[PDB]
From Swiss-Prot, chains A, B:
This is Alkaline phosphatase. Belongs to the alkaline phosphatase family. It is found in: Periplasm. Keywords: Disulfide bond, Hydrolase, Magnesium, Metal-binding, Periplasm, Phosphoprotein, Signal, Zinc. It catalyses: a phosphate monoester + H2O = an alcohol + phosphate. Its main location: periplasm. Isozymes 1 and 3 are a dimer of identical chains, isozyme 2 is a dimer of heterogeneous chains, one of each of the subunits from isozymes 1 and 3. The gene is phoA. Zn(2+) 2 binds at D46, D364, H365. Pfam families: Alk_phosphatase. Zn(2+) 1 binds at D322, H326, H407. Disulfide bonds join C163-C173, C281-C331.
Amino acid sequence: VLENRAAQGNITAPGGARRLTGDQTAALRNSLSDKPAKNIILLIGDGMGDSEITAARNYAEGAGGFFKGIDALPLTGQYTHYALNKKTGKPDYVTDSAASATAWSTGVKTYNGALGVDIHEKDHPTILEMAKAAGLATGNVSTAELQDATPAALVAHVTSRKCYGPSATSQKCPGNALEKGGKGSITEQLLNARADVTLGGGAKTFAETATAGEWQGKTLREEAEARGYQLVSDAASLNSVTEANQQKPLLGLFADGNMPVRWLGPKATYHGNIDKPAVTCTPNPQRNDSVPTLAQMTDKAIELLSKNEKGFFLQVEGASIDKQNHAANPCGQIGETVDLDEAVQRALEFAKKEGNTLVIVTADHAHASQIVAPDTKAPGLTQALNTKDGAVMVMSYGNSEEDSQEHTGSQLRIAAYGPHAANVVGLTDQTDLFYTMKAALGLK
Amino acid sequence: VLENRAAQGNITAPGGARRLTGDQTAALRNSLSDKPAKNIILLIGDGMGDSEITAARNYAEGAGGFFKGIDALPLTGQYTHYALNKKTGKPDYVTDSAASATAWSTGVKTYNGALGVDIHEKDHPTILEMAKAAGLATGNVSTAELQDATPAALVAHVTSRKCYGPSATSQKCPGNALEKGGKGSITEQLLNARADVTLGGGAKTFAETATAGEWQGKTLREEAEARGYQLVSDAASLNSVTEANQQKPLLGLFADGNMPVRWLGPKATYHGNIDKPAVTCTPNPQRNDSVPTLAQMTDKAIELLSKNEKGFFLQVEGASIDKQNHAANPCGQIGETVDLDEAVQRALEFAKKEGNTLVIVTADHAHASQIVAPDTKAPGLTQALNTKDGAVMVMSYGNSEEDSQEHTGSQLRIAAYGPHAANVVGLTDQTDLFYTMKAALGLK
Ligand SMILES: [Mg+2]
Ligand SMILES: [Zn+2]
Ligand SMILES: [Zn+2]
Ligand SMILES: [Zn+2]
Ligand SMILES: [Zn+2]
């Protein structure tokens, strides 16, 4: 299980493409622990199936390369992530962002759109919740708006992922409407859960005013204030933070909607690989250096959370890999996958020094992107890219005639490292994750 | 390291969709072994990626089901399979059957179309060739033409996979043309290789006559006989074989071209899931009860080969999963995947009983099929299918406007069971497989 999996030499020569330097049996044995996990970090690469991991590596590190973080986890497996059809209760083979996040955080399958509720619209506790119960610290970082499905699944129990704040809930989730005696909108339930560290975007929703409860009349941000939440808005004030706890919880909103993608590149187009020049991704000028990178947020969050002796549970989401995959933008997608990789490196570094940390990197569901031959005449959107190898790689998006390339139901890679990582091996189900995390922590 | 990975109960209830009944740690620990593997069975599902395995499972077993074979191998990982560009020597991200086949059977990357040769055209010994030299028994069974890329890669070193027999070789691989003093076509080199058990289709090439050497004038089929080969053409005669060895090698040719596929169903069409009704596959009425099945051929081979005291190496190929994926034909593709799974079961059953066998199941490269949502208005070819769940599943084939769908470069699953199976876990390269087997067997 040598943690260096790049090609061993000259890929044109016998044995030069090999990634293994020796027999793993001994090494793997030594990486298998029954011992309890003290902390847990779950990295979700949104829409990061094996094709996205492959394409991003080929570009960033070259075909024979190797992601120091993403590719460095010793225990691997694949898992099913199908959802349920609300009415019939039958499987719906292509899950969305909300139906899936609910399963690893809850342990029960649900219909597309549901956050923290089963098909009967019944609530079930999330793992961030139970953790907090047991005494552990909790954090939730993301590069998308916190109201989005992935960060939200940990804290809200809503009937529709679209009920971000007071305005939308009153009409899409009337039974969750605060005025209707419901727990409140995603943003409200988030502010109630009070995880120790929460970072992402979606500041806009915090501007809506609450309609019931104590803080009626006051915007959600003012409520955050009145409730002891420290609010940071940039890289700067973030490092300025020295503690985050139940009386000093940190809440960082680094963008109105989602944060900006790191790379800029043209959108894939019809016969783009043929009628258009190969592209080389460049950095995104719209992104300011004050907006912290996912790795910075992961780092600070790990820093603040590692003080609680009981341990901690942290969930990091490289949100936009899924975003740009829908947008048919190979460069944005790849940049984002590299970004998550840096994030995982930080996780893996802490995990490695600490010893009792269980790191898990996976995705919520597959997506559109496919790596095809350079001469492909495909019916979808395509584009040619100049990889690190000095070769051309062509990516293809061909499952939607609409403005957005759809998700896919193929099972995808799941990798873990640490205490109890052995349960991530083989075929499992996305729900098993919830049970795997809960027992590694001894959550009950 | 469980053998039952099925959902455990009602998938709508909490933990009902779970596949893990406990903690794999000790189970896996107990499956890690480095003792020498006396035998090796390599089951290759042509173009069978994680999307292909998922669709077939969703269909034949239902979303929460599980393949008694394909899904029961405890050790898992993902491997890359990029090819090389002949001139540049740089990676060619999307390999073909020959380059890939050549990688695992030799340990050296090569350009696409090559069999047994590196990019400089130098021949390198295959794992079958080294097994035979070490005294082991060798078997190569496939559901397609024996001259095809996958089975050929083990017995031939040719510059073009198209060099099937005397003719094609004269004009495409003249340097290999026997007349030009070369080793000969794929068919000719196959008869020279003399593995104890060789089974598949592609008998129409054996009808060509050699141009030189001892058997010039004679058809390759006659040469086969003349050289002491037992010729079986159907199930009955196959089952009748009492022994297969170096003095009594078995040659089974069950079809002119590829053997017939198991299932039938229409080809996917533009907007097929919209304009058309759901499909339900039916068995192929063209398939003569007399044509043996992959599982049957896998079984006999195992029976005849398991007689050599030293041990054996067998390679099995579910050829048409790929051919049907190309042909945008779900029913044929899924059927062929169900077919490989039966053969896998036969392998695993032997493996568990014997206890010193290493069984590996994977694919040469990823393919085109995608599992998309029912209302997907895709730009390519789609089709709706009635799955075991009584739910509807849509499959999309949207990477080519030609009459053929293409392979893809995404890294794909590889699973193993037995001595040295731990060398599959994590990220590895397709060439590493060669080295894993070579070490497992003790080939020098
Ligand atoms: Mg998300
Ligand atoms: Zn998603
Ligand atoms: Zn999405
Ligand atoms: Zn192939
Ligand atoms: Zn093919």
